[PDB]
Structure 1
């Protein structure tokens, strides 16, 4: 293989893992319904359901997300066409993609199976995720958001613990970002939307920053930090943002989440500021055995 991964920084471990995934992907060509065998259900959200499957031609285990959309065949063909751009999203912080196709009123998004599941699933088992672990998660999210913005000019639009995936090798990656404008158009009482997004305002990277801030507060405290549908959104829009409890969390992490949750999107931190925040600088220097922690608290082999 003739890798063109020079644009990425990549340490040796990151390079070896990304090349190993892209090498396995070479076993995968055109994707068809008949070529899959369902193993189990990974989870289900609002948009669809995701299955752990076996791709029979390649022998690869994959995560297959199915989204029910039996609409005008021309508009769904544009969705599928736009989803092919996921073939160009190669990053240590973005879940690997195999292909997207349509069959029997369902669009399938086939991706790399992340054996540690999502952070909302690990949150259930862990109770609360330690600050040191959230440090590495925060790095992964900022770096993934940066890659999507700089390289493909795409905003995530769906940052939350269920869209942050982990594995036994200690990798933290984003999935379910807004790569297809038509999929967004053609498409809970726990909301991660920024106060300006809930009011109407055009999507900005600042809206993903808020979403990340709220997700970190929930993972650190073990509960959604804000019930009745309108009551919940009225609190996000009209009441002060939540804060981390003092004493239990360092001043750097409290300042980091505070900067993400600033109601004013102009005052709110941007990715460049967050990458050089003291919480990130501190977390980057720390030696945190993320894989050891993940495997021991969720019982992964």
Structure 2
């Protein structure tokens, strides 16, 4: 999936920057032949993390997951072109609009996220980094799950303890959490938190520093919506079963697709409206 024979800078042009951070710059790229836009990383022996990421991406051909457009290794730089999502990240949308999503909007995101997760889990791919910032929007009002970096760094490890009789109980449990049917449950919890983040702009425990947050997650009862009366019983029930601290009894995405919070969602209209409103808001000067 990494093309060696083709030179990438004859097919793509880097026309802008989308972001920057701890994992380098993300560029906006334009196809000089077709005019298609991509999010791009041009990366100059931790390229094996990116190699595993490309392989996941290439395997993850699905309507609600970001589509890999091309990967190259040329002169050396590793190029990785992925489909541009002009609607942006849902957390940027909430910041731009200065508000959380409506329940109808959350229902669409939830339905589509569940379809994506059901697909990934079928392929034994665990995302492990769900959050509103990794839910990207199209102008049509569909999501795309993004950022398989954590997924890939985790998979590289597993692809790469003790002798069982002598193994401590906590070691048995954490090695048993590395495999089916427990590994994928993590994404279901993170989905629930993401839905709260979308309802309330911030996730639970946002006021605490990251290290205190970890203690809080382990020891606290599962998070609930701050103002329950704003939300349907269906939404609160959905969260109640998704935010199960016990991964054994936490439902799969397939099971959650039959929950009445999402089982009747057959239109993306609420999300298409959201993206239109965000676009119009961005235009204000």
TM class by smaller structure: 0.7 to 0.9
Task: Quote the offset at 1:30 in angstroms.
Answer: 3.9
Distance 1:45 1:277 in 2: 38
- Aligned pairs for 1:154-233 (under 5 A) are 154-177=125-148, 178=151, 181-182=155-156, 201-202=177-178, 204-226=183-205, 227-233=208-214
Distance 1:237 1:106 in 2: 41
Any idea what SS the aligned residue of 2:25 has?
A: strand
Distance 2:6 2:74 in 1: 13
Unaligned runs of 5+ in 2: 161-169
**Contact 1:84–1:100, Cα closer than 8 Å, also in 2:** no
Give CA deviations for 1:215-256 in whole Å, capped at 9, x if unaligned.
110110111221322211110111112101310111100111
1:291 and 2:275 are equivalent in the alignment: no
Any idea what SS the aligned residue of 1:99 has?
A: strand
Task: Quote the offset at 1:287 in angstroms.
Answer: 6.8
Distance 1:252 1:33 in 2: 50
Structure 1 pair 205/281, CA: closer, same or farther in 2 (3 Å)? Answer: same
**Contact 2:104–2:270, Cα closer than 8 Å, also in 1:** no
Report how many aligned residue pairs link the two structures: 255
Structure 1 pair 66/285, CA: closer, same or farther in 2 (3 Å)? Answer: same
Structure 1 pair 291/58, CA: closer, same or farther in 2 (3 Å)? Answer: same
Task: Quote the offset at 1:32 in angstroms.
Answer: 2.1
Task: Quote the offset at 1:140 in angstroms.
Answer: 0.9
1:134 and 2:106 are equivalent in the alignment: yes
Distance 2:31 2:52 in 1: 22
Distance 1:260 1:171 in 2: 22
Give the match for residue 59 of structure 1: 35
TM-score normalised by structure 2 residue count: 0.77
Distance 2:11 2:193 in 1: 40
Structure 1 pair 162/136, CA: closer, same or farther in 2 (3 Å)? Answer: same
**Contact 2:90–2:135, Cα closer than 8 Å, also in 1:** yes
Task: Quote the offset at 1:76 in angstroms.
Answer: 3.4
Distance 1:62 1:134 in 2: 26
CA RMSD of aligned residues (A): 3.1
Task: Quote the offset at 1:85 in angstroms.
Answer: 5.4
Structure 1 pair 67/209, CA: closer, same or farther in 2 (3 Å)? Answer: farther
Give CA deviations for 1:86-140 in whole Å, capped at 9, x if unaligned.
3343211111111223457754321110000111111212320111101000011
Structure 1 pair 240/170, CA: closer, same or farther in 2 (3 Å)? Answer: same
Larger Rg, first or second structure (1 or 2): 2
Distance 1:57 1:134 in 2: 37
Task: Quote the offset at 1:263 in angstroms.
Answer: 0.9
Any idea what SS the aligned residue of 1:247 has?
A: helix
Structure 1 pair 268/97, CA: closer, same or farther in 2 (3 Å)? Answer: same
Unaligned runs of 5+ in 1: 1-28, 187-195
Give the match for residue 164 of structure 2: none
Task: Quote the offset at 1:52 in angstroms.
Answer: 1.1
Alignment counterpart, residue 276 of structure 1, candidates 239, 258, 261: 258
TM-score normalised by structure 1 residue count: 0.74
1:38 and 2:14 are equivalent in the alignment: yes
Structure 1 pair 48/162, CA: closer, same or farther in 2 (3 Å)? Answer: farther
Give the match for residue 237 of structure 2: 255
**Contact 1:35–1:57, Cα closer than 8 Å, also in 2:** yes
